[PDB]
Design a protein around this motif. Structure first.
Motif, PDB file in Angstrom:
ATOM      1  N   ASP A  65       0.893  -1.267   0.068  1.00 57.25           N
ATOM      2  CA  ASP A  65      -0.139  -0.044   0.131  1.00 57.25           C
ATOM      3  C   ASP A  65       0.890   1.174  -0.063  1.00 57.25           C
ATOM      4  O   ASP A  65       0.374   2.272  -0.715  1.00 57.25           O
ATOM      5  CB  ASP A  65      -0.854  -0.004   1.246  1.00 57.25           C
ATOM      6  CG  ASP A  65      -0.245  -0.155   2.460  1.00 57.25           C
ATOM      7  OD1 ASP A  65       0.411  -1.304   2.700  1.00 57.25           O
ATOM      8  OD2 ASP A  65      -0.501   0.623   3.300  1.00 57.25           O
ATOM      9  N   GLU A 153      -2.950   0.827  16.193  1.00 55.40           N
ATOM     10  CA  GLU A 153      -2.376   0.895  14.739  1.00 55.40           C
ATOM     11  C   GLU A 153      -3.629   0.569  14.014  1.00 55.40           C
ATOM     12  O   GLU A 153      -4.354  -0.571  14.195  1.00 55.40           O
ATOM     13  CB  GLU A 153      -1.299  -0.163  14.179  1.00 55.40           C
ATOM     14  CG  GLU A 153       0.016   0.521  14.602  1.00 55.40           C
ATOM     15  CD  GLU A 153       0.126   1.655  13.554  1.00 55.40           C
ATOM     16  OE1 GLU A 153       1.191   2.355  13.917  1.00 55.40           O
ATOM     17  OE2 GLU A 153      -0.308   1.791  12.604  1.00 55.40           O
ATOM     18  N   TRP A 227       3.052 -13.494  10.824  1.00 58.23           N
ATOM     19  CA  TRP A 227       4.289 -13.138  11.409  1.00 58.23           C
ATOM     20  C   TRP A 227       4.484 -13.268  12.823  1.00 58.23           C
ATOM     21  O   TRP A 227       5.238 -13.322  13.578  1.00 58.23           O
ATOM     22  CB  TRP A 227       4.672 -11.522  11.015  1.00 58.23           C
ATOM     23  CG  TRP A 227       4.017 -10.489  11.586  1.00 58.23           C
ATOM     24  CD1 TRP A 227       3.711 -10.369  12.869  1.00 58.23           C
ATOM     25  CD2 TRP A 227       2.957 -10.032  10.734  1.00 58.23           C
ATOM     26  NE1 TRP A 227       2.696  -9.052  12.802  1.00 58.23           N
ATOM     27  CE2 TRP A 227       2.191  -9.323  11.739  1.00 58.23           C
ATOM     28  CE3 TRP A 227       2.230 -10.318   9.661  1.00 58.23           C
ATOM     29  CZ2 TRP A 227       0.940  -8.632  11.200  1.00 58.23           C
ATOM     30  CZ3 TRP A 227       1.228  -9.590   9.112  1.00 58.23           C
ATOM     31  CH2 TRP A 227       0.648  -8.499   9.840  1.00 58.23           C
ATOM     32  N   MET A 327      -5.230  -3.738  -0.205  1.00 58.94           N
ATOM     33  CA  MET A 327      -5.184  -2.270  -0.162  1.00 58.94           C
ATOM     34  C   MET A 327      -5.110  -1.634  -1.625  1.00 58.94           C
ATOM     35  O   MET A 327      -4.554  -2.356  -2.415  1.00 58.94           O
ATOM     36  CB  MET A 327      -4.268  -2.008   0.917  1.00 58.94           C
ATOM     37  CG  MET A 327      -4.631  -2.420   2.309  1.00 58.94           C
ATOM     38  SD  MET A 327      -3.293  -2.156   3.257  1.00 58.94           S
ATOM     39  CE  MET A 327      -1.843  -3.139   2.953  1.00 58.94           C
ATOM     40  N   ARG A 341      -5.944   6.396  12.199  1.00 61.87           N
ATOM     41  CA  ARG A 341      -4.998   6.051  13.419  1.00 61.87           C
ATOM     42  C   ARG A 341      -5.297   7.073  14.290  1.00 61.87           C
ATOM     43  O   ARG A 341      -5.546   6.813  15.212  1.00 61.87           O
ATOM     44  CB  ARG A 341      -3.609   5.899  12.838  1.00 61.87           C
ATOM     45  CG  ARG A 341      -2.636   6.010  14.066  1.00 61.87           C
ATOM     46  CD  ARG A 341      -1.285   6.271  13.994  1.00 61.87           C
ATOM     47  NE  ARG A 341      -0.521   4.997  13.074  1.00 61.87           N
ATOM     48  CZ  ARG A 341      -0.382   5.182  11.817  1.00 61.87           C
ATOM     49  NH1 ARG A 341      -0.261   6.677  11.163  1.00 61.87           N
ATOM     50  NH2 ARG A 341       0.162   4.467  10.902  1.00 61.87           N
TER      51      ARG A 341
HETATM   52  O1  LIG Z   1      -1.954   0.409  10.767  1.00 60.46           O
HETATM   53  C1  LIG Z   1      -1.788   1.242   9.501  1.00 60.46           C
HETATM   54  C2  LIG Z   1      -0.574   0.283   8.733  1.00 60.46           C
HETATM   55  O2  LIG Z   1      -1.071  -0.843   8.474  1.00 60.46           O
HETATM   56  C3  LIG Z   1      -0.505  -1.687   7.452  1.00 60.46           C
HETATM   57  O3  LIG Z   1       0.719  -1.972   8.187  1.00 60.46           O
HETATM   58  C4  LIG Z   1       0.832  -3.257   8.532  1.00 60.46           C
HETATM   59  C5  LIG Z   1       1.677  -3.989   7.721  1.00 60.46           C
HETATM   60  O4  LIG Z   1       1.012  -4.203   6.468  1.00 60.46           O
HETATM   61  C6  LIG Z   1       1.882  -5.493   8.279  1.00 60.46           C
HETATM   62  O5  LIG Z   1       2.865  -6.283   7.592  1.00 60.46           O
HETATM   63  C7  LIG Z   1       2.209  -5.471   9.752  1.00 60.46           C
HETATM   64  O6  LIG Z   1       3.635  -4.954  10.057  1.00 60.46           O
HETATM   65  O7  LIG Z   1       1.437  -4.420  10.517  1.00 60.46           O
HETATM   66  C8  LIG Z   1       1.350  -3.433  10.034  1.00 60.46           C
HETATM   67  C9  LIG Z   1       0.334  -2.452  11.119  1.00 60.46           C
HETATM   68  O8  LIG Z   1       1.081  -1.977  12.050  1.00 60.46           O
HETATM   69  C10 LIG Z   1      -0.193  -0.798   6.386  1.00 60.46           C
HETATM   70  O9  LIG Z   1       0.735  -1.675   5.349  1.00 60.46           O
HETATM   71  C11 LIG Z   1       0.726   0.572   6.486  1.00 60.46           C
HETATM   72  O10 LIG Z   1       1.041   1.412   5.629  1.00 60.46           O
HETATM   73  C12 LIG Z   1      -0.343   1.341   7.348  1.00 60.46           C
HETATM   74  O11 LIG Z   1       0.116   2.568   8.027  1.00 60.46           O
END
Ligand SMILES: OC[C@H]1O[C@H](O[C@H]2[C@H](O)[C@@H](O)[C@@H](O)O[C@@H]2CO)[C@H](O)[C@@H](O)[C@@H]1O
Ligand SMILES: Cc1nn(C)c(COc2ccc(N3CCN(S(=O)(=O)N(C)C)CC3)cc2)c1-c1cccc2c(CCCOc3cccc4ccccc34)c(C(=O)O)n(CCN3CCOCC3)c12
Length: 514
Positions: A65, A153, A227, A327, A341
């Motif tokens: 995204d 988040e 993960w 997304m 957020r």
């Molecule tokens: O919460 C907003 C956040 O969501 C997504 O991030 C995820 C990410 O995709 C996952 O791989 C994992 O790391 O958890 C993250 C959420 O803390 C969006 O990709 C990111 O751009 C966005 O800000």
């Protein structure tokens, strides 16, 4: 700035970076090139800042995204795999990393949230969000709680918010239709806030607090991605991974992300990075090496995803994905995420009501499009002498009156300040579409170094119109829209929080009301 003859990779701290480094060492054993893997804090915000100056890592990992914004800013190299390699990944994962017709990243893995539950406390996980309060009452009496997950988040709260009708950008994606403050979004976020009010959840719970509570067996359920499975495995908790609870009869809809690897547009090692990503990482052994550190999800590589899919935790992941939605990668995704957020946190903590919190987030997610609409129409009607006949559309009352207000106060500025405007227009001499790209530097220097108020915003846009008239006279009318985009980007990113606090362009209209 980036050193040649090696590879620096950035990946997020919740992913298998030790596994990734192992693939790096095998690359080193073959080529003599060192591979450094780093997982810095907030790397998705640091990358665009450092890469803009020609610095940063050779390869950045993140869900897809964010990559539209990076590609729009010229920060990513176009990737050009041959058909033999493209055929090895699932078509839909390639689509996720296609921006304006070009592939801008290698897709790695498909990620979706699931409900993770402790089979020793809840042999039967709830099918509905509605039944979680009563289950929590039942578990509290035993010294446990029903559910804890990261509330800082929005990624984790979005499934509930989209369940009953909330959405980011409608459908192609209509960037003008934002669904952050409609009845469905409200219904989901209200249910979350009520959970907090009734002591079923704590507004302060984050990733670490929720992970440790589940992995110690204090809470029966959590919400997380693949993960997180490794750390649960180590705690020896007896966990299942299953479909998220429904809300108001409908499925929770998580935003699905594709972990993807982008090559820095300023990196001198693009052939090395392509070689590493295609011939070492995106292979059965390469992804396994990462997967054994922290599970990746349903990987993009067909040969390996055929074995993982047999795992029920992956089948549950892909079932939650099919109920959710990939997304967007459009550049406004970052602005959307920042807004939601703030709204989830303020609503959970009580700083705003659900109505307040989502209205602001709606105004934040729409800020760029709405500003561009106004600024572009003003510049073009000023340059050509004739208005745009096209309907204004969503929030069209605001845009129409903002533009009418701007006609009033902007024309008086171009007249009164014609001397300063002429002088500024010569120090800068604008003859090319390329020169217009050099403006943002001086434009930001001036706009940034002072106080904030609607009057300087009018100056900003009025000189914009002054410059548009000139571009039209020298047969450079093609440069007016790129000028309107640069003005709008400078305005929205330097005054985002101020503008949202003014109720956006409604404040503008009210501030200059006669
Ligand atoms: O919460 C907003 C956040 O969501 C997504 O991030 C995820 C990410 O995709 C996952 O791989 C994992 O790391 O958890 C993250 C959420 O803390 C969006 O990709 C990111 O751009 C966005 O800000
Ligand atoms: C250089 C320079 N000398 N002088 C004298 C000006 C005008 O001076 C003004 C001062 C006040 C006002 N008004 C405020 C109150 N109201 S009102 O509310 O009552 N209402 C009735 C609406 C409206 C009138 C208007 C003009 C300039 C001047 C030139 C080009 C652009 C500006 C900007 C906008 C930011 C720069 O953008 C661009 C820069 C370069 C290429 C660009 C292409 C597109 C677009 C924008 C570009 C500013 C500003 O940031 O303000 N300034 C002035 C900065 N000055 C401030 C004084 O000290 C030194 C610095 C400019």
């Amino acid at each position: 700035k980036i050193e040649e003859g090696k590879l620096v990779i950035w990946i997020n701290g919740d992913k298998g970076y030790n596994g990734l480094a192992e693939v790096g060492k095998k690359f080193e054993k073959d080529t003599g090139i060192k591979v450094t893997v780093e997982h810095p804090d907030k790397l998705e915000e640091k990358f665009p800042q450092v890469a803009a100056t020609g610095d940063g890592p050779d390869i950045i990992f993140w869900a897809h995204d964010r990559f539209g914004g990076y590609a729009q800013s010229g920060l990513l190299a176009e990737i050009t795999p041959d058909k033999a390699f493209q055929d090895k990944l699932y078509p839909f994962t390639w689509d996720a990393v296609r921006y304006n017709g070009k592939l801008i990243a290698y897709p790695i893995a498909v990620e979706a949230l699931s409900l993770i539950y402790n089979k020793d406390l809840l042999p039967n996980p709830p099918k509905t969000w509605e039944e979680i309060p009563a289950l929590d009452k039942e578990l509290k009496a035993k010294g446990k709680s029903a559910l804890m997950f990261n509330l800082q988040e929005p990624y984790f709260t979005w499934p509930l918010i989209a369940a009953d009708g909330g959405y980011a950008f409608k459908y192609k994606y209509d960037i003008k239709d934002v669904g952050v403050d409609n009845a469905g979004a409200k219904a989901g976020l209200t249910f979350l806030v009520d959970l907090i009010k009734n002591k079923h959840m704590n507004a302060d719970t984050d990733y670490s607090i929720a992970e440790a509570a589940f992995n110690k067996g204090e809470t029966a359920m959590t919400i997380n991605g693949p993960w997180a499975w490794s750390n649960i495995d180590t705690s020896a908790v007896n966990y299942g991974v299953t479909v998220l609870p429904t809300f108001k009869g409908q499925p929770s809809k998580p935003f699905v992300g594709v972990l993807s690897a982008g090559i820095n547009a300023a990196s001198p090692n693009k052939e090395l990075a392509k070689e590493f990503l295609e011939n070492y990482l995106l292979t059965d052994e390469g992804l396994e090496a990462v997967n054994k550190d922290k599970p990746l999800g349903a990987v993009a590589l067909k040969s390996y995803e055929e074995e993982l899919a047999k795992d029920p935790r992956i089948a549950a992941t892909m079932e939650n994905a099919q109920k959710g939605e990939i997304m967007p990668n459009i550049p406004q995704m970052s602005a959307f995420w920042y807004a939601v957020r703030t709204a989830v946190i303020n609503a959970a903590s009580g700083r705003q009501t659900v109505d307040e919190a989502l209205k602001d987030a709606q105004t934040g997610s729409e800020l760029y499009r709405q500003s561009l609409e106004i600024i572009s129409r003003y510049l073009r009607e000023q340059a050509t002498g004739a208005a745009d006949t096209a309907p204004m559309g969503a929030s069209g009352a605001t845009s129409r009156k903002a533009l009418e207000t701007l006609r009033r106060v902007g024309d008086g500025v171009q007249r009164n300040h014609e001397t300063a405007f002429q002088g500024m227009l010569r120090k800068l001499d604008i003859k090319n579409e390329d020169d217009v790209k050099s403006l943002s530097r001086v434009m930001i220097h001036v706009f940034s170094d002072g106080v904030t108020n609607w009057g300087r915003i009018v100056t900003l846009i009025s000189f914009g119109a002054f410059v548009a008239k000139h571009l039209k006279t020298i047969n450079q009318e093609s440069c007016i829209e790129p000028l309107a985009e640069s003005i709008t980007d400078v305005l929205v990113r330097t005054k985002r929080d101020w503008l949202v606090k003014q109720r956006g362009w409604d404040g503008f209209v009210e501030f200059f009301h006669v």
